[PDB]
Design a protein around this nucleic acid. Structure first.
Length: 437
RNA sequence: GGCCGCGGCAGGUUCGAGUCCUGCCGCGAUCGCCAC
């Protein structure tokens, strides 16, 4: 009921249980056993090493430390060969430079090669920042681990946790910085309410000042923004969430939300009461990781949104969805039908040459002068939003993002009305329209 | 690998288009971002 007891109740939700903690130490003792077996210099980093890792989020990260006499050549190769002999099931994923994902005694493991460096300079790759982040926090985070998890869980419940493009929220490392800055979970929430889009937080300097952008200065890298990939709208949501919490704090703030799935009938009544045009672009999911797909579905939805906008259909909102098979680009427009004719602007009556040319073109209706310049009645190729997007997506598929636009080129369909409500987009359509209980 | 920001080239549209379409090359050796 009070603020005090809520935070402790919530702890249970964010804190790994002992057998989860246990899973991690065994896999840590074995890993550390295999490298001391193969005698490589290393360091453990990340949420696990700082004991800040979130419940059910367990991942062991291990950085392999190479002298600077080497290059990517010994890094890529002999960074892979070390992973194979230790990891049980090795899945090789990529980054700027490739690393080795996998498992050891049930626990997930990431093994990332890098340089043995002094000081936070000569830093090129972003995988190089990672161990220095740890050295910095390791000392300042000791004892505040639980405050960190509280912040993380609060965010992850509201869907803004993590910096991947699927989220564009607050990265874990950023959370750790905040608690080190504001001292605890609560004070962060207390303080976040007063943040602005121009807020600069210099962690290392104990300073908050006004910038050109919302900026968290990496203690390690004074030029880098730890908050770089946080979207404005997600910061706006966080500030909005912090205020709500302080006004009326409840445990609900730490509990993951319902999708709000609605029945297609009641949903049929809403769309008809709004009297809007609700339609969707359906196509097969490109086989690509989400951090490619999602940024593209964002772009695709934008290019088409701007189109309906440019085309005077008065779009309201756009969304998207990724199922296992299909991807959906969602739209709602104020305009279900527009007239066949419009007004193109002509040249000023004074302008001889350009007027002769404007008045020559074959048009079904006679042009006219209004406010000292010529206007003509013209004819659009499509009178409805669904028609224009068919037209637009078909010709312009290539600007819809590489991989998404390519699948849209090789197939796609426009859904609306009852067939639309049959698709597994019902939750998204609700958020888009802002449907209540 | 993709997104994003720029720079350049050739074509389209339009009465005209530095602002829109289109495709191409280049750029991120002071870090753009994401493999959370």
């Amino acid at each position: 009921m009070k603020v005090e007891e809520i935070l402790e109740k919530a702890l249970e939700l964010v804190i790994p249980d002992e057998e989860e903690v246990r899973k991690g130490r065994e896999a840590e003792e074995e890993l550390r056993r295999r490298l001391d077996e193969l005698g490589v210099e290393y360091v453990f980093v990340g949420s696990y090493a700082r004991n800040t890792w979130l419940k059910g989020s367990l991942e062991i990260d291990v950085f392999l430390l190479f002298p600077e006499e080497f290059s990517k050549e010994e890094l890529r190769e002999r960074g892979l060969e070390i992973g194979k002999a230790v990891l049980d099931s090795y899945e090789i994923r990529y980054a700027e430079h490739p690393y080795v994902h996998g498992v050891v005694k049930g626990v997930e493991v990431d093994v990332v090669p890098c340089y043995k460096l002094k000081e936070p300079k000569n830093i090129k790759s972003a995988v190089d920042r990672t161990p220095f982040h740890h050295k910095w926090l390791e000392g300042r985070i000791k004892g505040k681990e639980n405050e960190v998890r509280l912040l993380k869980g609060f965010l992850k419940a509201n869907g803004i946790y993590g910096a991947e493009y699927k989220v564009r929220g607050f990265s874990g490392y950023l959370c750790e910085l905040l608690i080190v800055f504001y001292g605890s979970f609560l004070e962060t929430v207390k303080n976040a309410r007063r943040w602005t889009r121009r807020t600069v937080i210099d962690v290392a300097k104990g300073e908050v000042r006004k910038g050109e952008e919302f900026f968290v200065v990496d203690p390690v890298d004074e030029k880098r923004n730890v908050a770089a990939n946080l979207s404005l709208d997600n910061l706006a949501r966080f500030v909005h969430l912090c205020r709500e919490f302080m006004e009326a704090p409840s445990l609900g703030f730490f509990k993951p939300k319902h999708p709000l799935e609605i029945e297609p009938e009641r949903l049929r009544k809403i769309v008809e009461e709004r009297g809007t045009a609700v339609f969707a672009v359906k196509f097969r999911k490109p086989d690509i990781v989400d951090d490619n797909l999602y940024p593209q579905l964002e772009r695709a939805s934008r290019k088409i949104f701007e189109f309906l906008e440019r085309e005077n259909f008065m779009p309201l909102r756009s969304a998207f969805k990724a199922s296992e098979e299909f991807c959906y680009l969602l739209f709602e427009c104020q305009i279900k039908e527009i007239s066949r004719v419009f007004r193109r602007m002509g040249p000023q009556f004074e302008d001889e040459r350009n007027v002769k040319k404007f008045l020559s073109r074959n048009r079904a209706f006679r042009p006219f002068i209004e406010n000292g310049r010529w206007w003509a009645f013209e004819m659009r190729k499509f009178t409805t939003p669904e028609e224009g997007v068919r037209s637009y997506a078909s010709t312009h598929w290539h600007t819809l993002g590489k991989n998404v636009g390519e699948s849209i080129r090789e197939y796609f369909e426009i859904i609306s009305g009852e067939k639309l409500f049959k698709e597994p987009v019902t939750a998204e359509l609700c958020e888009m329209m802002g449907v209540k209980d």
